Motif scaffolding. Structure first.
Motif: not given
Length: 491
Positions: A356-362, A364-369, A388-393, A399-401
């Motif tokens: 959760x911290x890495x998904x949000x901090x690194x 730029x996701x919401x906790x909801x997401x 792993x894939x959200x940057x390359x995607x 694609x949008x986040x």
DNA sequence: TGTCCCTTTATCTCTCT
DNA sequence: AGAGAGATAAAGGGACA
């Protein structure tokens, strides 16, 4: 000293080199192989590390670990090198299937038996290879194959089972036992207990089918007169993988759970209607007053968490992690219950705590997401894959986040993400599909096979889909997925 | 022990409307 | 999209040579 040091010294003496090419096995992999395959598996891997890496067989390192980490994994390794060409050429199987067959206890037996019996099964009984493989792809596959061979006729003719049904049964560990027990109990359960064959098949089609069927036979009367259960509910407990254990336990605990804790019988069946349902029912009995006291979890919520496979793991993990998740990670408990209320709740919860911290901090996701991604079966798998894939995607693809999160937020979201990464170019670049359309196809359960179906058709056209434009095929893909894609192949 | 078979549990992916 | 179903993994026991 210790009887095992000479063995362990040999384990590590070799283990060092497996970290080198071609395999480059990491502590993890090496543990796995040492643990399940034994010392002889680890030496086997090493000895044949080249033979089964490139020319000719070309296995990935993951595939080599897959085969070696079982009882007799050495034998499965020596057998794969021998029979894989034969099976792939003389029987038309692919590498995937062969490996899947090999990756089980007694993998050599199973392979050798596929080799000896696939033709006779495919003709004289008209099974497809896919079916011959599914039956093989379990511990003891050799037996299920021989037992399918022996009992397919009597089971279809003297008992009325379809070949699909016979296969469903056999395609589980202890498949031979399941078949032999269906032979015996099928009339009894249909005539004496009014079960339909589809239900008897349903109960028998899990590991420990033999124990499940027998135990249904034994406790269905008790549970129905003396407990107020319908046969419907009883089959549900039996056919869901909890089986013998889940049935015996329900008889024990249903009265208690209804009396003391105010659970409906219905709520109790949902807890047992899952693999390890017994672990789930007991844990509830221990933890229902606990989680409802120092938390504010309602019993509905507690039942909800318990009503999935590994509910016990889910409930125990909720107990430990609820505070820290709520306090440190700023989650509401409702969110916490939501993450836990799926199969492998434990994993989703542990993975959220960590990611959760890495998904949000690194990223730029919401906790909801992050909750939304995690609130599905194999959520852990989706979370690690988003990472792993959200940057390359969203970086090359475009694609949008929001889009990536839509793909990840369904059962098998890992599969759907990895698949979108593979097949977005060709779908867009080669066949004219818009990214928004690909997302739409992948933003459903069964995302991966949906995509593969719509690439199958476009790349190697079946004229039976001719009268459908892309958009039409897409609309099918978003609504029915693979299933709707094929059925249309049959029209 | 090495290998094979089996049962239970836990996890993960897909289907079915 | 929630129930049902199928596939895969993990762990450990019996059994036998």
């Amino acid at each position: 000293q210790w009887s095992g040091a000479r063995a362990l010294e040999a384990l590590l003496t070799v283990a060092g080199e497996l970290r080198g090419p071609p395999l480059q096995l990491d502590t993890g992999q090496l543990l796995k192989i040492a643990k399940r395959g034994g010392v002889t598996a680890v030496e086997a891997v090493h000895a044949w590390r080249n033979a089964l890496t490139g020319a000719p067989l070309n296995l990935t390192p993951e595939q080599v670990v897959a085969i070696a980490s079982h009882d007799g994994g050495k034998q499965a390794l020596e057998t794969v090198q021998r029979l894989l060409p034969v099976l792939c050429q003389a029987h038309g199987l692919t590498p995937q299937q062969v490996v899947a067959i090999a990756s089980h206890d007694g993998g050599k037996q199973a392979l050798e038996t596929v080799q000896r019996l696939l033709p006779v099964l495919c003709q004289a009984h008209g099974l497809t290879p896919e079916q011959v493989v599914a039956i093989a792809s379990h511990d003891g596959g050799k037996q299920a194959l021989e037992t399918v061979q022996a009992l397919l006729p009597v089971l279809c003719q003297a008992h009325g089972l379809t070949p699909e049904q016979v296969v469903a049964i056999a395609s589980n560990g202890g498949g031979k036992q399941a078949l032999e027990t269906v032979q015996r109990l099928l009339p009894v359960l249909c005539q004496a207990h009014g079960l339909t064959p589809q239900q008897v098949v349903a109960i028998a089609s899990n590991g420990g089918g033999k124990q499940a069927l027998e135990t249904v036979q034994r406790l269905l009367p008790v549970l129905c007169q003396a407990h107020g259960l319908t046969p419907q509910q009883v089959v549900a407990i039996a056919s869901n993988g909890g089986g013998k254990q889940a049935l015996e336990t329900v008889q024990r605990l249903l009265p208690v759970l209804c009396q003391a804790h105010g659970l409906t019988p219905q709520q109790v069946v949902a807890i047992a209607s899952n693999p390890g349902g017994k672990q789930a029912l007991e844990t509830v009995q221990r933890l229902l007053p606990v989680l409802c006291q120092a938390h504010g979890l309602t019993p509905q919520q507690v039942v909800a968490i318990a009503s999935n496979g590994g509910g016990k793991q889910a409930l125990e993990t909720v107990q430990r992690l609820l505070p820290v998740l709520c306090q440190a990670h700023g989650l509401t408990p409702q969110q916490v219950v939501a993450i836990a209320s799926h199969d492998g709740g434990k994993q989703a919860l542990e993975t959220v705590q960590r990611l959760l911290p890495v998904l949000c901090q690194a990223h730029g996701l919401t906790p909801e997401q992050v909750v939304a991604i995690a609130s599905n079966g194999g959520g852990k798998q989706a979370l690690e894959t988003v990472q792993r894939l959200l940057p390359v995607l969203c970086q090359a693809h475009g694609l949008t986040p929001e889009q990536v999160v839509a793909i990840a937020s369904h059962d098998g979201g890992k599969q759907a993400l990895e698949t979108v990464q593979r097949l977005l170019p060709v779908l867009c670049q080669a066949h004219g599909l818009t990214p928004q359309q690909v997302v739409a196809i992948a933003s459903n359960g069964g995302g991966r096979p949906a995509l593969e179906s719509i690439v199958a058709q476009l790349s190697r056209p079946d004229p039976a889909l001719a009268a459908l434009t892309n958009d039409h095929l897409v609309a099918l893909a978003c609504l029915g997925g693979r299933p709707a894609l094929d059925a249309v192949k049959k029209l």
